[PDB]
Amino acid sequence: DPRIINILRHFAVLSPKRIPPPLRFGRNRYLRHWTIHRAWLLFRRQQREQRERILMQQHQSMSNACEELRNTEGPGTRETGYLYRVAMLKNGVYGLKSIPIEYASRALVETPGRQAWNHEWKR
């Protein structure tokens, strides 16, 4: 029971009557936050427009390569549109082994590890 009371005391502190009240800013204080909020959403816009610009540029590179590839005849005797029809196949793309877990598992970190990169890796 004594352990459970500690649990209830934690919820009691979160009760609507206990939690702090809404903020109360003055004019200058409010205006200062208004610029911080206005600048953050603008910074997000710049990051969004940039993030979307690269995605469009990359996508336009594929369309240019695939459209050109769709017209190419080869190699040698192979009929027009072979390499394109083969590149568009999605064999194994939506299976279990689609993406290697060694690549996806690794995520960005603020600072590197003891060994930033492993050059001694052998097949």
């Binding site: 200058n28 200062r32 610029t35 911080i36 206005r38 600048a39 603008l42």
Partner: peptide
């Protein structure tokens, strides 16, 4: 002046809007 108040976030937020 209000815009010249030495506050970190307010002066970093006012520089983003300036060069924009």
């Amino acid at each position: 002046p209000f815009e010249q108040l030495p506050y970190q976030c307010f002066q970093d937020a006012r520089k983003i809007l300036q060069q924009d």
